[PDB]
Amino acid sequence: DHKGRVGHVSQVIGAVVDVHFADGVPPVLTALDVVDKLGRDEPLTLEIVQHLDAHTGRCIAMQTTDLLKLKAKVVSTGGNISVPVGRETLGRIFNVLGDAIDQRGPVGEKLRMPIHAVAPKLADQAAEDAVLTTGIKVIDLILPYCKGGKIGLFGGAGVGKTVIIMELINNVAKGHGGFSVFAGVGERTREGTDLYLEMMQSKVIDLKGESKCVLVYGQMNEPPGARARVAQSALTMAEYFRDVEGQDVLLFIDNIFRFTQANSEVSALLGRIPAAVGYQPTLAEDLGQLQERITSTTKGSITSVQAVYVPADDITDPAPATTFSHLDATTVLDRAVAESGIYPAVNPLECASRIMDPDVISVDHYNVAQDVVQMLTKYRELQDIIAVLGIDELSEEDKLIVDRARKLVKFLSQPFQVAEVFTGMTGHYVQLDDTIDSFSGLLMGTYDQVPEMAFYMVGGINSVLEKAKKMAEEAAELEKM
Amino acid sequence: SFFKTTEMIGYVHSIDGTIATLIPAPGNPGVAYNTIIQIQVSPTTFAAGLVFNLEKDGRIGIILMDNITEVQSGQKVMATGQLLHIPVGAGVLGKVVNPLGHEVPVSTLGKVDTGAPNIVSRSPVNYNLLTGFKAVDTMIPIGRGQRELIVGDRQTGKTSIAVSTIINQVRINQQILSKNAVISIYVSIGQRCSNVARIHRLLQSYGALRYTTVMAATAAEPAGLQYLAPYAGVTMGEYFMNRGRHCLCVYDDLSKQAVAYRQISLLLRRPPGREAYPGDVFYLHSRLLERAAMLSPGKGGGSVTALPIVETLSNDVTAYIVTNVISITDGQIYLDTKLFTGGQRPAVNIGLSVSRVGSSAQNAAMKGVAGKLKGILAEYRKLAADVQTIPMIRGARFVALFNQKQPSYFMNAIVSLYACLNGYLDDVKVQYVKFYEYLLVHRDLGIMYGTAKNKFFYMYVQELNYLIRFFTLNSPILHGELEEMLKQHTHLFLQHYQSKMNAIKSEKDVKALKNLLYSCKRAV
Amino acid sequence: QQRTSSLYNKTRQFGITAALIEILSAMSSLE
Amino acid sequence: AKKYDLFGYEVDTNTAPWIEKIKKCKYYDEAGEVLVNMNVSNCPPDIATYNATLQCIYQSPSKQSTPVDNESKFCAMMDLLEEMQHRNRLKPNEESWTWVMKECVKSGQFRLGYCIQQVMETECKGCPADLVKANEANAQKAKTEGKEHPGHLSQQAGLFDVKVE
Ligand SMILES: Nc1ncnc2c1ncn2[C@@H]1O[C@H](COP(=O)(O)OP(=O)(O)O)[C@@H](O)[C@H]1O
Ligand SMILES: Nc1ncnc2c1ncn2[C@@H]1O[C@H](COP(=O)(O)OP(=O)(O)O)[C@@H](O)[C@H]1O
Numbered sequence A: 001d002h003k004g005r006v007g008h009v010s011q012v013i014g015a016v017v018d019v020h021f022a023d024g025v026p027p028v029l030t031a032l033d034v035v036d037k038l039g040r041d042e043p044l045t046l047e048i049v050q051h052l053d054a055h056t057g058r059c060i061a062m063q064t065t066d067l068l069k070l071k072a073k074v075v076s077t078g079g080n081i082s083v084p085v086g087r088e089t090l091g092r093i094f095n096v097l098g099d100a101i102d103q104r105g106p107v108g109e110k111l112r113m114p115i116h117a118v119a120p121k122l123a124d125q126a127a128e129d130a131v132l133t134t135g136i137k138v139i140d141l142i143l144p145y146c147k148g149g150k151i152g153l154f155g156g157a158g159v160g161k162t163v164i165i166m167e168l169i170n171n172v173a174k175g176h177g178g179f180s181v182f183a184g185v186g187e188r189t190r191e192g193t194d195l196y197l198e199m200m201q202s203k204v205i206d207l208k209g210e211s212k213c214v215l216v217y218g219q220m221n222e223p224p225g226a227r228a229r230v231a232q233s234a235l236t237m238a239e240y241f242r243d244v245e246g247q248d249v250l251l252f253i254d255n256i257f258r259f260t261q262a263n264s265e266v267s268a269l270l271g272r273i274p275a276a277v278g279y280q281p282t283l284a285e286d287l288g289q290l291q292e293r294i295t296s297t298t299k300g301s302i303t304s305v306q307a308v309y310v311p312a313d314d315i316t317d318p319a320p321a322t323t324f325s326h327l328d329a330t331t332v333l334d335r336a337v338a339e340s341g342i343y344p345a346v347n348p349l350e351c352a353s354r355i356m357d358p359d360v361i362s363v364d365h366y367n368v369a370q371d372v373v374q375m376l377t378k379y380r381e382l383q384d385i386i387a388v389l390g391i392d393e394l395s396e397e398d399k400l401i402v403d404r405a406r407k408l409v410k411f412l413s414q415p416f417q418v419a420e421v422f423t424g425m426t427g428h429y430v431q432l433d434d435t436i437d438s439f440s441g442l443l444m445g446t447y448d449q450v451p452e453m454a455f456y457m458v459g460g461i462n463s464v465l466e467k468a469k470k471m472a473e474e475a476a477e478l479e480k481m
Numbered sequence B: 001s002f003f004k005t006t007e008m009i010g011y012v013h014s015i016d017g018t019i020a021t022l023i024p025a026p027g028n029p030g031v032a033y034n035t036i037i038q039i040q041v042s043p044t045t046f047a048a049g050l051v052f053n054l055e056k057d058g059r060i061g062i063i064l065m066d067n068i069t070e071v072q073s074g075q076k077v078m079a080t081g082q083l084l085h086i087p088v089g090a091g092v093l094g095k096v097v098n099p100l101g102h103e104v105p106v107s108t109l110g111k112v113d114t115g116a117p118n119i120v121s122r123s124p125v126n127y128n129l130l131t132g133f134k135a136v137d138t139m140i141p142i143g144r145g146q147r148e149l150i151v152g153d154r155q156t157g158k159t160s161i162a163v164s165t166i167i168n169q170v171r172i173n174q175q176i177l178s179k180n181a182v183i184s185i186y187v188s189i190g191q192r193c194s195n196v197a198r199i200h201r202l203l204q205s206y207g208a209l210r211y212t213t214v215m216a217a218t219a220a221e222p223a224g225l226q227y228l229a230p231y232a233g234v235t236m237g238e239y240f241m242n243r244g245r246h247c248l249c250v251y252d253d254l255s256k257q258a259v260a261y262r263q264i265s266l267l268l269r270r271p272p273g274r275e276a277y278p279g280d281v282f283y284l285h286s287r288l289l290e291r292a293a294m295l296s297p298g299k300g301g302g303s304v305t306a307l308p309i310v311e312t313l314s315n316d317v318t319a320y321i322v323t324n325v326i327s328i329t330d331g332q333i334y335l336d337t338k339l340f341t342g343g344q345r346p347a348v349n350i351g352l353s354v355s356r357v358g359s360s361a362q363n364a365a366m367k368g369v370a371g372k373l374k375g376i377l378a379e380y381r382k383l384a385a386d387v388q389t390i391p392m393i394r395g396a397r398f399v400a401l402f403n404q405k406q407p408s409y410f411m412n413a414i415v416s417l418y419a420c421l422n423g424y425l426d427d428v429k430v431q432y433v434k435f436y437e438y439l440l441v442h443r444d445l446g447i448m449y450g451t452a453k454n455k456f457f458y459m460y461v462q463e464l465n466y467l468i469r470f471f472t473l474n475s476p477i478l479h480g481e482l483e484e485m486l487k488q489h490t491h492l493f494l495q496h497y498q499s500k501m502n503a504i505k506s507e508k509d510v511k512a513l514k515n516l517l518y519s520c521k522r523a524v
Numbered sequence C: 001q002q003r004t005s006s007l008y009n010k011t012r013q014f015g016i017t018a019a020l021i022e023i024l025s026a027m028s029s030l031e
Numbered sequence D: 001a002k003k004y005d006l007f008g009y010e011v012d013t014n015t016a017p018w019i020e021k022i023k024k025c026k027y028y029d030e031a032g033e034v035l036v037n038m039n040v041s042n043c044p045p046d047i048a049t050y051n052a053t054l055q056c057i058y059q060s061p062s063k064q065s066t067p068v069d070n071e072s073k074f075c076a077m078m079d080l081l082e083e084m085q086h087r088n089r090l091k092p093n094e095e096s097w098t099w100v101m102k103e104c105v106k107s108g109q110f111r112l113g114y115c116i117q118q119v120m121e122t123e124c125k126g127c128p129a130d131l132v133k134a135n136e137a138n139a140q141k142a143k144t145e146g147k148e149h150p151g152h153l154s155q156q157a158g159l160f161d162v163k164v165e
């Protein structure tokens, strides 16, 4: 039905394009190919977003709308924008539409699914409360990521979102029997190359043999129509591995703000009145239909890490604030923490996790993790007193809390394996058993005689005592000279 | 349910996500305002929608509800000519339901659009409603028919304190006459889908589904359902209210309802004002919360208690939607982010929180102890800012007692507070208050072979709860018998149990002491 | 404390003027 | 004879029709449903009506056909007393507390019985004897048979080792 139904371009205002159909308009979300010739190098494909009347329908362009004349011939596809799925996609790079953009021949496909799927019902939902050990101290201890969890990395410009996603791909996605999908939603085209090469070097993507990754990129260079829809294209591929193949899968959306921001561009041109802070009025609904599809069904299990840009370091902004409600482990990155020297720049008080609970994780995990949060809360109150009065003015017990709490802030830092170029030191995968025991002993006061800078930028307790030995030896030499 | 068609009022003209406008059919019948209309998406299937605008042209503005993907321009539109009615009653309990009334798989109807009880229809709130928290039930006491706001940041315990209030009713409801049972209605507006599932399992494990029904409009579902979800929640409660029974209504949350209503208003070209919300966004929450009330003796004496949740961004009460709901409700329960991370859970900021009808709402026994606690904590908070007095000692123990995960039973709460009031936990240190309270409730030291000899008053006998509510602790019947129980418990705890703390200064015993004390925070 | 509170209060009011001028300048473009 | 509500309107003091509805009781949750229906028809419960309800709580089994979890005729009974004393402002007469004493000895909860004979003796100055010896019999019954308290909780010497569950 409506398969090759012909229409003509009624109006062109930016990426938003109106189309007149003689025999009635197609349905909503229907993809339309612009058949007319023009002087183009690349094709044009329009997706209907609204209907104006029975014969006219408003659309958004996935490619640029350059050289588009009025009354240009337009033809329907059959349904929504269709994207290839299955194991033939693994190893290959894709765009919003599902065309291969890596110059390695035609894809093996054999099936295509629509980009705009409906979210699972209540009956399809299932909770599997197991800890996903990220090998990172601040995450595993304070806001542990769960299996099947939707996870969000909130932070402003240049804080360590892209660095943390890359470290999670090293730490978790390599030793994983499942496949992975990377939604490059409106981010740097140059960052996409470095991921493709580093995965080829480590052999998670393999040319000659078995691949365990899919790349779907709709970057900053692309117009808003693509950058909006490209998040869903990747999600359709992950949905195939979840529902059909019945499997545990990872999803990586960098960045989910760029989805909301892309919709904010079209929404203005579509003629909607903007809501708070100039965003689209359908901001909560846009995230709703996208984020609800990202979930652990009875058939399989998506485990999505997402990056979330906090514009102007304003966490009260609608784009992050609306996203926070959807997530299981909310990771919040602060600029002042980054500039002070602590990387990753995770502010643990604003963070939270659902599985931070005595039932899911062990009793020893919860009790130690709470004491770190409690001690850091006392430390922030004491930090205001030292600024006013002084370090000497504090009590005898409170001085010892400051010495431990200062070490807790330093020990929360960690040199990442992907960030060897930045830190100038080799990485550290810290085990969950190491993380809990080392922090437990620090709270007890077993490492009071250990110096403070020993804890800065190291892994577990063995690396702390190793650096403390090097500090003792070098301090002994300089004192002798 | 499958709604009742009548007349074909028009065709679908435009769609914009979850909103549409119609052109009238030949004749220009004109549908009635605020009524449901069924759009024929296929010959077999329909798609519901609510009428929001009746333009001069003849065009009719629609808010889409079901099968939004299946709606198209040029489709036929049938009218009901009636306001939205939904399934309501005892048969709906223990199930998840839409605002339209369809059950989610996992009874005479009632109007969702209804006027609130008038001046002579209501009465002063006297019946108490136990949240099961020593912090709340003393300082910010909720009465049946009251509207008590819950405000605070994300992950401060807004849902948990509301859900545990529903769970607290099961222990009473099981024992009491069903006339006075608190039937709960948890409305989930704009939440994530798995969060509703976890609450369903959590309600099921504590036997709450028997005395609870779950209204649900998740984030996947459209703005039309989210807008209408709290209204459908109250409708289900009003059945119990108008038929002489007491009810509870949690809206989680009104912040996401307002955003859904703003979407609807903006998409239909309603002039926006402050923070882009329409003119009547105050009226939205006002007519919702005013339907929650305490009826008179002349109309059954039933009730609908309201617990609206409203999320604040970085402790900002000056936001338009937050300030609106504060001015409607009878005070609030403020949840501070710094208290949450600091240790105090639930993180109830007592200075910021307030109940406008607190004293009259409380039980006679609870009014006795709580009147003194206001005097002690007032002096403790002042002296903490500016050498330990009696108020400083006893005040600090109350703060330790207010920490709790699951809700406390009325007997187990009031006795542990009465102990601290008369000063039974003065010699007991601050860190060992939860171990002292645990050994009071579950165990008992007097009976633990020796100095017992009480004729009736013990803590294992849970049935004394209702005798305490009648006579109070300060009374010739229970005063002397209670003060024995506490004297035996303190002397034995200080002698036998607290003596360990001077001793235990070794590895594997200090850690054993910690793990013991940390588990005592959870169980009250 | 006096002068910072005044700046908070000026920013509160100036924010809501600027918010609404932008929002209603949008629908003047949309008719 | 005459009575007025909080506003000052006339109120139906005709109690006797609603009393005979409570007598045809069968299960005691139906008594509450009648107590609702009186208030709905501007007829507040009389002092005799509460005693007629208290009778039905004692005589019948519990809520209805199926059993509820943790049934307690005493807790349902003592709630109704709290309603008449505090809210409705009515002192329960000698008949009221005698129904309470019967349920303690009938169900076997003697420990409550010790508390409520103290109540019945004080204030309302009456010692009904009949049930006092029947209550004291159940007290000695627990001692001589095995033990009176829970038993497994009492004897177990804790001191550092206490299970948290
Ligand atoms: N774990 C880390 N180790 C070292 N440097 C880091 C780390 N995290 C962030 N950075 C610093 O942050 C900068 C940019 O971070 P990036 O994640 O690319 O930005 P964004 O947070 O906007 O995604 C880098 O130049 C790097 O020096
Ligand atoms: N009284 C409490 N004691 C301990 N933990 C709590 C308490 N209340 C809430 N929490 C924890 O805080 C987290 C967030 O609770 P939630 O009710 O979802 O807050 P919000 O509704 O503000 O997001 C949960 O993981 C929960 O276990």
Ligand SMILES: [Mg+2]
Pocket (backbone or CB within 6 Å): A161, A162
């Ligand atoms: Mg980045």
Ligand SMILES: [Mg+2]
Pocket (backbone or CB within 6 Å): B158, B159, B160, B252
């Ligand atoms: Mg919540």
